[PDB]
Structure formats: C-alpha cells, structure tokens
Amino acid sequence: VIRHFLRDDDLSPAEQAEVLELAAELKKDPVSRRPLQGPRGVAVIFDKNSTRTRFSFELGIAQLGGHAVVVDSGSTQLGRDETLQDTAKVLSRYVDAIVWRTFGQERLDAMASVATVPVINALSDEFHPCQVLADLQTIAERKGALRGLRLSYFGDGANNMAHSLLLGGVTAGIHVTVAAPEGFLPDPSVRAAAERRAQDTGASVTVTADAHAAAAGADVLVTDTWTSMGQENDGLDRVKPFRPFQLNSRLLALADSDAIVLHCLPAHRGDEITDAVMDGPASAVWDEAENRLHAQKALLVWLLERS
Amino acid sequence: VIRHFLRDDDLSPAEQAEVLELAAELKKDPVSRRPLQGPRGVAVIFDKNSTRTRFSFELGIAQLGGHAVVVDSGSTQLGRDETLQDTAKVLSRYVDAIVWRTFGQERLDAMASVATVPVINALSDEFHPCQVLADLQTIAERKGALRGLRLSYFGDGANNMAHSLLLGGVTAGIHVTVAAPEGFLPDPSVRAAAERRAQDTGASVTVTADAHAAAAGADVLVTDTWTDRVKPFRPFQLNSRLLALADSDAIVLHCLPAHRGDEITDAVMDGPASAVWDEAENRLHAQKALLVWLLERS
C-alpha cells in the first residue's frame, strides 16, 4: 500500500517516532541514505511559491541521491487544463514521490487517491505537517522526550500551524493549548481529530482566549504570522484581535523557566513576536528552520521504504 | 560534423531506427549511459514555457550524468540582449548540447548553423519531433515492427504534431493519413518532404476530410488539442464510434494535455486501446536516446 503524508495524523504515534528518529540520524549523517540514487526524480510542485519550502526540499532530495524537478506557479496551475487524476498518473511514471504545495485539502486527497507514489503536503491552507515534524525534532533536541510536555500556540488559531501543532503535537504525547481570540479558533473537525488521537497518547487539547493562562507552566511557546497572503483582503482587522497574544518577554516570563520558543519563518518582528524573544536564549527558531531539511528528508526516506 | 535534430526527417530511416533502439535500451536501464558524467552541462532554453517538455528533459539529462541549466520565463529569452550568434558561441563553451523551445524555425536553423554543439528542437510551432520519437517508441512496444502499420491523425492537420507524424511516421515506414477539415491542412512543403521520404521506406501520405475512411483499418489513431470556434473539428473527435472502425488491437495516442470531451472522449482515453500514459513516460526515454546518439556523433 502506498503511504501518503497529507496531514500530521497520517502517521500513527509509533510511525511518527520512527520518522523523528530518522530525522536525528540524517542530521548526523546527511548523505548516508540514498533511496533516490540514480538519480530518481521527485516532483516538487507549487500552486503558490514558497522559497523556503522549495529550498529545503530541493537540497534534501539531492542529498538522498535524487533530482528534484521543481514546478513553480509560473506553470499552468494543476487542474486548469488537465485533471488532477491525469497529472497523478503521468507523474507516477516520472518520479518516485510527489511533493505538493496547494490550497484546499480536497486537492491533496484527489492526487493521493490516484497516485501510485507517495504524495506529501509540503504546505497547504489547512495543515503544515512537514514544519511540525521539524518543530518536534527541534523540541526533542532541546528538551529530550516529547511525552508529557506542555506546548502553547498563540495567535490565529485556525491557520495551518495551529492545526498541525494540534494534530502532530498530540500524536507525540504533547499537551497542546491553542490561545486565540474568538472567531479565530481551530476548525472543529481538526480539534475533534486531535482530541481523539490524544486519547491514544495521554495528551490533551485546550483552546482558550486567556493568553496568560496558556503561557503559565508551558514548556514550549509557539506563534506564527497573524495573516497569510491570501487573507490580506479578507476585510478583517488582523492586528487588534491578536495584540493580547503577542509572544513577548512578559508572556515568556510566565512560562516554565526552561521554556523554548518556536516560530515558522518568516516572522514579522514586533507583531506576533518581539526582537527580545526572537534573539534571546529561549529561541529555537534557527535550529527549527534548519531542521526542515532533516525532517523532510526523513519523511521521504520513511515513505519511500513503506511504499 | 555536428548533428542537429530540428525536424523529424533530420534523421534518416536507419538513424531513426538506431535512436528508437537506444530508447528501448535506456527504458530498461535508465542510468547505464553516462555521456554527460562530470557533470557536463546541457542548456534547456524556453522562449515560451512548456512545463512537460522541461520536466522530461531536466530529469533525462540528470540520468545521463549531466546537469541541465534551464532558462525559462523570467530568465532572459535568447536574442534580447545579444545576437543569437554571440549566445551560440558562449553556450558552446559551457554545455555539450542546446535544447531549445522556440517558435519560428528560422531561429532554430540560425542557432544550429553557428553552434558547435548539437541543437535539439524541444518543441516548435512547425514540428514536435521529440514527441513523435516517443510515439514511435510507444507503438513499437505495443505492436512490434513499425514498417507497414497504418497511422491516422485526426483534428488540426496544420499543427506541429500533424507535421511531425507525417515526417517521422513515413521515416519509420508507416503509412500516414491526416484527417482534417479544409482550413487546417498540412503545410505544403512539409507534405512534399514526407511524400519524398515515403518513397524510400515504402510508406505513403494521405490527406482527407473523411474521418471514417481514415479510421477504417487504422492500427494507430492519434489526435491533439484543437487549439464555437471549434466547429470544424467536431466530426474528427476520437470517440468510441471512430475507434470501433479500426483494426483489432489498434492503439490511441495523444500528446498531453487532453481536453476530455473535445478532441477525445473519456471512454477512448481510459479504454484498453489508450496508450497515452506510456506515451507520456516515453518522452523521457526517447529524448535521452536522442541526446546520447547526437552526443556520440558530435
């Protein structure tokens, strides 16, 4: 059976642990695994460009021995003059895996329903599961065992990072709190899936508007930009609601004394996170960015071996 | 002494047979030929984007051991900052071959007359000769011998696939029929070149507006996108009714993308006669064979 990775809970707790261990092994020995030797191809397709996502995948695929064929948004968007199913059938003849950045989850589902190679969600509207693998690798590096840790996410609680932190976090046994204003709460289906997965791992899900309560006793504090490019014209003031949730020094001081801070780059210094927090000793954002390379390579190695 | 591939008949019948044999060998052993090991470079230049063309060449060059340097939209189209002759001299210092998607054929001929490395027409307004190499590879693996098969192309008979199926088909000994409406017939000079080449191979060239007669007894049925501004092409749709008139075990080809419901139906596209998925994959193998062959003689 062909395995895909479209959202964080596509891996069981045991499987996620396997991928995270592989990510640590690959960080130590980055060119020791060559499942794409040849080179074999991997398609890396962007319905909307993401330079950082392309950078890490392109280099990582090369270090697995392969050749990434990158298709940027300058090409005709998939689905516009050929069905996704037809594209999947041809790609399955050319490459050993399909890495895709797209929008709605239904598009990823349609591709994965037909492709005979693994399909990976590089980044989408609803989830960012590869970044959360990198996040979990980073937390393990700086904290040790993930089970039982307390992680709080602040800001827009319905964006892709909030959803993947919920799903990926509870899969790892982490107690996850989303601190967000009313009207910006996690998708109910994602929250229910996280609550169910949490029953298997001893984790828990909390959603609150009380940012100070969310930070108290936290081991990991996370935030992300308050607005995606697609949201700039949605009509909302996307600054005023989030100001109480800014990851600043006062908020960090409420957390456990050994707490660390994560943020997917790019960051907007002075909005969701302050310079003092970005550049202080609690910040893990630089290691986090680097671990995108290793965690994505580990995911590819794992999916290719299982598929 | 430096060989180019700008149109289908740039290869003789014997040379075409060599390239198709190489494509079959490379399909079976895709990293066994490493003429570009190093890596040595190959330029892949697009005056107009073609993602599918870029995709197959880029991966194929890598599997020959090389590094494709791709110049597409956003990067500099050739001849805007310097003469094409100046570009050809510098490229000949950097890469071992030049793969170019451009429009008019006078631009390809100009490059090829100056460059001292092989120039390949990746796709042009007048010819699509790499796709036809992939088509011939697909027909051979489904049918065996190409000589004496009947191939019919339906739809726009003035586009690059019609021209290349004429030239490449008769070069392989295939009897080629183009079924097209009156405003969309092959370029007369291309048709004449195909009729001449067919004399050497025992093939033939037929142009007709009668889609039923073109489908009757055909072994290979081919179509392509038509672009109601498509009224004249509707009688030429590859549907189940047309396919039912062909020889037993006939196959259907279509350079992708396909507009399902226009030039070809779901039933034909997804049925047992369709070979469009193997055909798409064989662009990789046939283009690698072409490059290996041109590099060995250049």
Added chain:
Amino acid sequence: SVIRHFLRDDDLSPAEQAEVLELAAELKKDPVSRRPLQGPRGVAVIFDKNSTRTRFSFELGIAQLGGHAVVVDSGLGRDETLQDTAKVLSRYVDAIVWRTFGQERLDAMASVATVPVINALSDEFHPCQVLADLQTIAERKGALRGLRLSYFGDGANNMAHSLLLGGVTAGIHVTVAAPEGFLPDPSVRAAAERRAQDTGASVTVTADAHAAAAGADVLVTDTWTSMGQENDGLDRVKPFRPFQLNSRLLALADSDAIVLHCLPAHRGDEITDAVMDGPASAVWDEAENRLHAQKALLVWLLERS
C-alpha cells in the same frame, strides 16, 4: 579560522590572487578534480536582480565541485533581515553567492555569515569577471606583472572599478579612459593606487582615448549603460562615442594586443564587429573562464574557511 569573503577584488592579497588564478588554470585542465562540495553540500546562489549568465556559470561550477546550487531569484531585506538570512543560510549551505546592488548589503551579510560570501556581481564591483579576465590574459600573454591594460567607456561602473583593483593586484598598469563626469569612485581609485604601490603597478585616469590605447597590451570595454541607468536623465551615447573600441583604436595598441569585453556586447556602440570578431578578441575564452575562475575562487575560500 577566519571566514574569508570575496566582495571586491582587493579582498585577495597579490599572493592570494596568484593562488586563485593558478587554481583556475588547474581546474580548466581537470574540471572535476576538486570536490570540496561532494555530498552534495549546498551553495546558495541568490539574485536580487536576475542574471542568467551569472546563474549558468555558478550553477554548473558548483555542480562540478560536487555540490548542489540552490538558486533564489528576484521573483532579501523585504520579508526578513539580512542578518536573519545569513544566520539560517549558514546552517544550510557551505557558501553564499549573491548578486545584489549596493555594497553595504554585501558587507552586512558577510559581517554575520559563518560561511564565505561571494559577490557574484554588484553595482560597484564585478570581481569574479575580473578573475576570469586575468585568467584569460595569462593564457594569451603569460606573466601578468608589468602588462599595460586600458579600459574605455564608463569609468565609474563595476567593471572599471574591478579592473582597477584586480588589475593592480596582479601587477598590471591600469588606465581608465572615460569622459568627464564618468570617472572612477575616489575611494576605489585611492585603494587601487595604494595596492599598486605594493605590486609595482600604477593607476592612470584620462579622457584621451588615443593616449590610453597607445602601447597597450590589453584593451577592455563594457556596455555604456546599465539597466538601472537607462532612466538617469543623461545622454549616454554622445559622451562615449570617442571611446568606442574600434579598429582605429586597436591599431594604436601593441601589435600583439588582445581585447576583452564582459558580455553582452552592444555591437556598434562600445565595440565594433570587426574588433569583436577579429583575431585580437579574447571575449569568448573570457566568457568561458567565468566558470573556471569562479570554481577556483570557491575552492580557495572553502579551504581557507
């Protein structure tokens, strides 16, 4: 060890430049014999403004060192700080190659990156092209020390500045022939004058193109106008016509003189067909040598850093 950068031509001492140029000759002869980036290791190649010629040379050169070039096109400083970019890239790649505009941006990146930073091309310098030029001159003429080189045209552009600095580092007597108002930046000119003291070279700036051509071993020109200057308000044709590198000018130089021009050339403006395509032209070898000289520079910086 100190991380070494190459942002302008005099970032290499005379002895260091000689080492890089010797390595360029070795790599031209044996282009896959140095594999410091085997793995592959990454090299970031970043363009604030796209340059297809720069991309081709670096992309292929990095690959021939065993590495993988990760190209980032103009389609830095906007989404995140240059310091933030340097921190993260220093974790991904073994070197940063950057085409940008003002020199202060290169300086800032190099001040904080923990891997070598290379100026691929900037508004003020083009030091990789001048390494390729020096490699070409050495192939055609042998020892560089004591040669006389004259550059004609816009005397304040990146090629004029780098021919001054890189030329006098190699011991070449450099003349810049340019009209009033188009003269080398004073700081660059003073730096070249000081460096020329160390090598026995010299710096000459003149408006007399005929005097600059007489006795020259190497004649160089470049486009009169960069893309960012097309809207600067000046007539950028009339001042430069007396400085065209044509057959009459070349005839004034030494009988064995060679001609250089960083491509692309606008035939009929700064250079003529007869010169460009005649036996004195070295422009094609010069373009090829971008590949070899940049590979040599990368090998050298990586080993020193």
